[PDB]
Amino acid sequence: ELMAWNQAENRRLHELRIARLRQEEREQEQRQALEQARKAEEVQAWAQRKE
Amino acid sequence: NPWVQIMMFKNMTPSPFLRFYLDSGEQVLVDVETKSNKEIMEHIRKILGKNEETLREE
Amino acid sequence: KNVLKIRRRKMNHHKYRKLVKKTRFLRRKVQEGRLRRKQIKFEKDLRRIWLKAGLKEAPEGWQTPKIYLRG
Amino acid sequence: DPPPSTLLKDYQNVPGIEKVDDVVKRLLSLEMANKKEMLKIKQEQFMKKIVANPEDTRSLEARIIALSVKIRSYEEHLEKHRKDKAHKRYLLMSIDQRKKMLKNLRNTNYDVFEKICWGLGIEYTFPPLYYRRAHRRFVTKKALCIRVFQETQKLKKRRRALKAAAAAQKQ
Amino acid sequence: VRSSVHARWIVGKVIGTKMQKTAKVRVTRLVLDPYLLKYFNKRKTYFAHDALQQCTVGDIVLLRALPVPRAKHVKHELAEIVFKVGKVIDPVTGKPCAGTTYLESPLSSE
RNA sequence: CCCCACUAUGCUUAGCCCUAAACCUCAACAGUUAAAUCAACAAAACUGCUCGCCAGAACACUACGAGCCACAGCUUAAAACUCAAA
RNA sequence: ACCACGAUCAAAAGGGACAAGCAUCAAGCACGCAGCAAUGCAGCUCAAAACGCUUAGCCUAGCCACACCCCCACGGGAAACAGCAGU
Numbered sequence: 343e344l345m346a347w348n349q350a351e352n353r354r355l356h357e358l359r360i361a362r363l364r365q366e367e368r369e370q371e372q373r374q375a376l377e378q379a380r381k382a383e384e385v386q387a388w389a390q391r392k393e
Numbered sequence: 394n395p396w397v398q399i400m401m402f403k404n405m406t407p408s409p410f411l412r413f414y415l416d417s418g419e420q421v422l423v424d425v426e427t428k429s430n431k432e433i434m435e436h437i438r439k440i441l442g443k444n445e446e447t448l449r450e451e
Numbered sequence: 452k453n454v455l456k457i458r459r460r461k462m463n464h465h466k467y468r469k470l471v472k473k474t475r476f477l478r479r480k481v482q483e484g485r486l487r488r489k490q491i492k493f494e495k496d497l498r499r500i501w502l503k504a505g506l507k508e509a510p511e512g513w514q515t516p517k518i519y520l521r522g
Numbered sequence: 523d524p525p526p527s528t529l530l531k532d533y534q535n536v537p538g539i540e541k542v543d544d545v546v547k548r549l550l551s552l553e554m555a556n557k558k559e560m561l562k563i564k565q566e567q568f569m570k571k572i573v574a575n576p577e578d579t580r581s582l583e584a585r586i587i588a589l590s591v592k593i594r595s596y597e598e599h600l601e602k603h604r605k606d607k608a609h610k611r612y613l614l615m616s617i618d619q620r621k622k623m624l625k626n627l628r629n630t631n632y633d634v635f636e637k638i639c640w641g642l643g644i645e646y647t648f649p650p651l652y653y654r655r656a657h658r659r660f661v662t663k664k665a666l667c668i669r670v671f672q673e674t675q676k677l678k679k680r681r682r683a684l685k686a687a688a689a690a691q692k693q
Numbered sequence: 694v695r696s697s698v699h700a701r702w703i704v705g706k707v708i709g710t711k712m713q714k715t716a717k718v719r720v721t722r723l724v725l726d727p728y729l730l731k732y733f734n735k736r737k738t739y740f741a742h743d744a745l746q747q748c749t750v751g752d753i754v755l756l757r758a759l760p761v762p763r764a765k766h767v768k769h770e771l772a773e774i775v776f777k778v779g780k781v782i783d784p785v786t787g788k789p790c791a792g793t794t795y796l797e798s799p800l801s802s803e
Numbered sequence: 804c805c806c807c808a809c810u811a812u813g814c815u816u817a818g819c820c821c822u823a824a825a826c827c828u829c830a831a832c833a834g835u836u837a838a839a840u841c842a843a844c845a846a847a848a849c850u851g852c853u854c855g856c857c858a859g860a861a862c863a864c865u866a867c868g869a870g871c872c873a874c875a876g877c878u879u880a881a882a883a884c885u886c887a888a889a
Numbered sequence: 890a891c892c893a894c895g896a897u898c899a900a901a902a903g904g905g906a907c908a909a910g911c912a913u914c915a916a917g918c919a920c921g922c923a924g925c926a927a928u929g930c931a932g933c934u935c936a937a938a939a940c941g942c943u944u945a946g947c948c949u950a951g952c953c954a955c956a957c958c959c960c961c962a963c964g965g966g967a968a969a970c971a972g973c974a975g976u
């Protein structure tokens with residue numbers, strides 16, 4: 343009974359983990375979207391300077 | 394519990410967890426991420442600790 | 452700080468170097484004798500190894516080198 | 523090493539670099555640059571060959587590649603400057619730092635550790651268990667102890683045949 | 694279930710694989726320093742029978758005691774590889790990881 | 804000690820030797836300026852963590868052992884006798 | 890009493906644990922593994938102190954060790970109070 347209760351506690355914590363990881367991807371995608379934009383401008387500026 | 398082997402491992406996985414190995418060969422995984430150290434002690438006491446009755450008798 | 456502790460060590464070292472210079476021919480004869488006994492003590496250690504292992508003579512083609520000579 | 527005609531890493535992706543005068547191509551090649559420009563080309567070749575994301579420079583893989591290029595440049599320097607103690611120190615320290623990196627990569631991502639060793643031609647070695655001088659007395663005695671063991675093994679085999687031969691005669 | 698071996702279950706780190714079908718395992722235990730009342734690691738070596746020679750230097754293994762020792766120093770057998778060196782599988786999520794970072798996101802399989 | 808002369812040596816090359824008051828006598832890393840600021844002097848006082856080292860003076864940068872291209876060398880390094888101080 | 894498929898007590902054997910000082914004792918020198926065997930592999934211990942020297946009966950409801958010496962005791966040296974009293 344205690345082992346089954348421990349397995350149910352791990353499953354509960356896993357659903358909270360998945361809910362936490364989804365919110366971190368949406369935030370990671372936003373950051374990764376700005377860095378690519380900034381990195382694209384710095385490349386274009388560097389490419390124009392070399393050209 | 395002087396005769397129980399306790400071994401620590403650092404930064405091997407993304408999240409912390411405890412694992413107990415029983416004499417029968419069963420393994421008990423305990424996820425401890427987000428829990429406080431007091432909640433961890435109360436958890437392992439409930440699933441694998443001797444109750445106050447068993448200790449009084451001894 | 453004064454240099455009285457240095458001065459004690461200074462005289463000790465001066466007298467030691469002078470003693471060694473005065474007896475450098477005796478010490479050279481003593482050092483030679485110690486290196487011989489040192490080589491003999493090393494040869495006995497290797498001989499103890501093959502005798503305790505059951506062999507009657509050194510392994511075929513083995514010659515204990517002189518590991519303490521200047522050469 | 524890359525050919526001298528290789529363009530610098532900065533002018534390799536500018537539009538129309540293949541239609542400029544030959545003189546302009548020389549002035550933008552490795553032939554007219556210092557050795558450090560050639561090392562940046564070597565580093566780029568290893569990245570595309572090994573790492574999964576050639577643009578990530580902070581990963582443990584990119585660092586091992588970047589340091590491996592520095593190690594090779596120190597070895598080439600010392601081949602000409604054998605009394606340069608300063609760069610001899612930089613070489614030995616860099617080799618130690620790469621071994622520490624490889625140890626950490628082997629423990630965390632073995633699949634990537636194998637591709638690094640193959641790509642860079644690194645033969646990983648485990649450190650010795652003890653650090654102590656092997657002086658003459660020890661080297662000599664250890665050689666004698668190995669000879670004594672080899673001779674005892676031969677005598678133990680010649681004591682099996684004689685016992686086996688005599689046992690067959692009884693029959 | 695009985696056994697004449699003292700250490701029934703022990704976890705350790707493989708430190709040697711030069712013997713045939715035998716893995717040399719370093720096992721550490723916490724021992725109380727009586728004067729300082731601080732726990733320090735105390736390590737001991739165990740030879741474990743590895744029939745398939747699947748142990749690699751550096752991986753964490755679980756050893757089970759044999760009914761009787763099979764050799765002078767071989768009293769245990771490899772029961773399970775807990776953490777394969779450089780190829781760890783997070784037990785909490787079941788996904789492969791490299792240190793404290795996932796190699797496959799847990800969100801991949803929901 | 805002062806004056807003159809001149810040599811080993813200071814230089815180059817190739818090997819050794821492996822020492823210094825090699826001391827800025829102030830170990831590395833991280834942090835603080837508030838509390839009791841703090842024996843004295845020196846270059847204000849502290850916290851966390853780690854490694855190294857120390858336990859009266861002298862004997863002793865010594866003896867012995869061991870290692871070392873070192874053979875009047877270097878490194879490591881005691882004890883007995885002695886004093887009630889240093 | 891006798892069998893006790895038992896209990897109690899407790900050898901041999903296997904696993905584990907178990908004094909002090911000296912590291913100026915730093916390497917030990919066969920100390921491992923696999924295999925039914927033949928035989929194969931070259932390993933095993935060690936600065937978290939191996940190997941070695943020196944000191945000491947111990948963890949005291951008591952325990953260990955010894956019992957003239959040669960660790961032992963066929964044999965040998967030799968002729969035995971470390972039982973009580975006694976010299």
Ligand SMILES: NC(=O)c1ccc[n+]([C@@H]2O[C@H](COP(=O)([O-])OP(=O)(O)OC[C@H]3O[C@@H](n4cnc5c(N)ncnc54)[C@H](O)[C@@H]3O)[C@@H](O)[C@H]2O)c1
Nearest residue numbers: 649650651652653654655656854912915916935936937938
């Ligand atoms: N002796 C070793 O080769 C060795 C092996 C594993 C761990 N260690 C660790 O080294 C430290 C010093 O040990 P010690 O007090 O016995 O040495 P020590 O200074 O007394 O020297 C004894 C021997 O160990 C070597 N040694 C010294 N310092 C060492 C270090 N940091 N790492 C490796 N070898 C070293 C010496 O060269 C010498 O051969 C300790 O922390 C120890 O755990 C040493």
Ligand SMILES: [K+]
Nearest residue numbers: 822823824825
């Ligand atoms: K010094």
Ligand SMILES: [K+]
Nearest residue numbers: 824826827828
């Ligand atoms: K100074």
Ligand SMILES: [K+]
Nearest residue numbers: 955956958960
């Ligand atoms: K006896």
Ligand SMILES: [Mg+2]
Nearest residue numbers: 452453454455
């Ligand atoms: Mg003055």
Ligand SMILES: [Mg+2]
Nearest residue numbers: 459460462463
């Ligand atoms: Mg004097």
Ligand SMILES: [Mg+2]
Nearest residue numbers: 810811812813
């Ligand atoms: Mg001259």
Ligand SMILES: [Mg+2]
Nearest residue numbers: 813814815816
């Ligand atoms: Mg000049």
Ligand SMILES: [Mg+2]
Nearest residue numbers: 823824825826
């Ligand atoms: Mg200076």
Ligand SMILES: [Mg+2]
Nearest residue numbers: 830831854855
């Ligand atoms: Mg330091």
Ligand SMILES: [Mg+2]
Nearest residue numbers: 858859860861
């Ligand atoms: Mg003193």
Ligand SMILES: [Mg+2]
Nearest residue numbers: 464822823864
């Ligand atoms: Mg000196």
Ligand SMILES: [Mg+2]
Nearest residue numbers: 864865877878
């Ligand atoms: Mg001296």
Ligand SMILES: [Mg+2]
Nearest residue numbers: 485866867868
């Ligand atoms: Mg000497």
Ligand SMILES: [Mg+2]
Nearest residue numbers: 899900901902
């Ligand atoms: Mg018994």
Ligand SMILES: [Mg+2]
Nearest residue numbers: 912915936938
């Ligand atoms: Mg030491």
